[PDB]
């Protein structure tokens with residue numbers, strides 16, 4: 001019967017109700033703001049700041065395709081002029097789009113296959129859909145792409161490793177950048193940054209990529225029919241000092257656990273976990289189509305983090321506030337399908353950001369299952385999750401619940417019961433409640449609930465629980481000679497505590 005256990009999801013903190021009154025939006029040394037704050041108003045397209053395009057071409061900023069320093073061999077010609085000449089042509093067949101994109105990517109004319117784009121256009125779309133694509137949608141995408149210098153007038157700093165820095169930009173500015181990415185215009189991007197140009201979406205024989213392209217075109221149709229009016233903030237967070245887990249005397253926090261529902265639909269206004277790759281967005285611009293890549297497709301503004309976010313080190317995360325949902329879907333991986341357009345009904349905060357906060361935290365990939373019970377590996381996951389959850393200088397009553405699930409399970413080989421306890425401990429340390437979605441696994445729901453209430457009723461601290469994890473390693477894992485231990489973790493914990 002029972003679809004959820006624990007604290008009712010209704011009793012969990014959410015944005016905007018729980019939120020602090022935001023300080024005045026303004027640029028600072030650690031906050032790049034690319035719009036006119038004095039003109040930011042509800043329901044109005046933000047005005048770029050500055051008024052005129054300013055260029056930086058260096059190792060600390062995005063290399064813009066419209067830079068006068070973006071050159072091609074002829075003597076040197078302007079590659080931005082070449083990109084205009086190429087893209088300002090009628091498309092009537094997918095070959096025409098391939099040929100356009102290759103005019104300014106000539107070194108890749110042999111290497112970039114467009115099979116998936118061709119299949120999408122010719123073999124997946126209805127003839128009327130394809131018509132609307134080349135008559136309306138692609139020309140509008142070209143125009144927003146070519147408007148980049150008037151839209152993205154302010155250099156965009158890279159969120160490099162170890163930087164604690166935020167970029168607040170307009171949804172409109174993202175749209176212009178993403179249209180550039182579609183047309184593969186970002187220079188020098190073809191090794192510690194994710195791919196941004198969309199060339200791999202077009203290549204190879206694929207059933208996933210046509211569905212990816214349906215999802216992205218749904219977005220591009222929307223933001224070219226009418227400019228979106230809000231802002232999005234991208235924050236890299238890198239922590240210097242981590243808890244002494246074994247000494248942590250904080251209590252556990254509340255838990256809601258359910259096998260029905262999704263982070264994105266049922267965790268509205270909560271801190272939504274992206275089960276991330278350390279290259280944020282994972283295989284979104286290529287073949288990947290599981291939880292991170294789906295989120296990045298239905299909220300495509302997340303993709304632009306790939307333009308400027310260096311690969312995450314162990315102590316870092318990326319926090320994205322304000323992305324809008326444009327699509328709905330069913331399935332995942334081989335069964336993923338674009339369903340329909342989604343009208344996002346989220347309220348906006350006082351910076352006109354959708355009240356949607358997503359954190360990219362990358363779990364480790366465990367080729368050997370027992371490796372993840374090694375203390376250094378448990379601490380690594382605790383500290384990553386803690387970095388993703390913690391908000392320095394916010395009171396606990398202003399913190400939404402964490403909406404998450406089986407982080408690093410699936411391809412990464414994580415143990416769901418261990419990872420649930422790790423996230424429960426990290427959340428407790430960050431003074432946040434947990435909303436946990438087991439994604440149809442009703443046994444796992446009961447198991448996590450049963451363990452959580454056992455530890456709470458016995459008033460064990462974060463430290464008490466961590467020590468029991470160390471016991472489990474030392475007694476059942478360390479000198480274990482088979483692929484799996486003799487005794488499972490939760491049974492071990494119950495016996496260890498009930499024995500006291």
Ligand SMILES: Cn1c(=O)c2[nH]c(SCCN3CCOCC3)nc2n(C)c1=O
Pocket residue numbers: 261262263264289290291294332404405406407409410437438439
């Ligand atoms: C809680 N949760 C998920 O676990 C999830 N997984 C997927 S894709 C398939 C892979 N997963 C299967 C469950 O283990 C995580 C790996 N999409 C998801 N969404 C939207 C979600 O809300």
